Amino acid sequence: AGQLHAALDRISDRQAAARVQAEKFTLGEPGIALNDVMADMQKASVSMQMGIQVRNKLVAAYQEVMSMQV
């Protein structure tokens, strides 16, 4: 409805934060410590995985509902 939009946006943010941090570390910046970036990227990946799993479940449920012989 009107809330899963916010969830997808939160996943996009959790990805973009770690991505920008990584792209800031490599390009010669003494701000990151090589350990925050890895943990945060792994957490972002886990979040995206949970998101795609929720999408798969919802799509399966909707397909089951619509495919009924009413």
Binding site: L8, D9, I11, S12, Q15, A16, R19, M48, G51, I52, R55, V59, Y62, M66
Partner: protein
């Protein structure tokens, strides 16, 4: 403003492609045409005279041809910026579904819209999704039958007159439909049937 990432973009795009058939074909574009075709097939007095496949293909080519201008404007406003990274998806969806709603808003009858208002209690053009989509589905259901009645009437008259002229000769035991079917097809051919039919359906959907 800000936008999404590539992964979630592909994700939502594939999900939209999944939703596409039921959410765009059965309740947004042409659900009147297949109902008209079904009522016609039942009016000819011959269930499944043409196969369902050819009718469902014709009722799809026709709706593509009808939606050509709306899909053209949506193509421009959506792809032309987004093909060259001018606009983001979270705004491309709105800027694309706005003119589609500008089209889908005419066919809707404001009485049913007010009924779904009473159903959702929205304050008074710029009507949100939930209170609009059924207000279009029901307002298309309520007009498909009003076309189908106009389609039926001539065949009903044919059946009644052939039944009467048959009864007027002392053959009260022979079924009339067996003799009606040939004359029904004869009349449906003699009046340039299918081209006039499609064209009138299109124009009546136009304005």
């Amino acid at each position: 403003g800000q936008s999404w990432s590539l992964s979630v973009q592909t994700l939502v795009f594939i999900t939209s492609l999944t939703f596409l058939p039921a959410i765009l074909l059965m309740m947004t574009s042409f659900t009147r045409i297949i109902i008209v075709f079904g009522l016609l097939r039942n009016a000819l007095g011959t269930p499944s005279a043409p196969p369902n496949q050819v009718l469902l293909g014709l009722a799809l080519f026709l709706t593509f041809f009808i939606m050509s201008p709306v899909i053209d404007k949506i193509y421009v406003d959506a792809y032309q910026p987004f093909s060259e990274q001018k606009i983001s998806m979270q705004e491309a969806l709105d800027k694309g579904a706005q003119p589609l709603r500008a089209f889908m808003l005419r066919q809707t009858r404001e009485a049913d819209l007010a009924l779904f208002a009473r159903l959702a209690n929205s304050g008074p053009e710029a009507v949100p999704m939930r209170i609009l989509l059924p207000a279009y589905v029901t307002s298309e259901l309520k007009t498909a039958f009003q076309i189908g009645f106009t389609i039926f009437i001539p065949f009903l008259i044919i059946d009644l007159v052939i039944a009467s002229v048959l009864m007027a000769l002392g053959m009260m035991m022979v079924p009339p439909a067996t003799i009606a079917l040939p004359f029904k097809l004869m009349l449906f051919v003699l009046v340039d049937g299918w081209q006039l039919l499609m064209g009138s359906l299109a124009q009546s959907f136009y304005s």
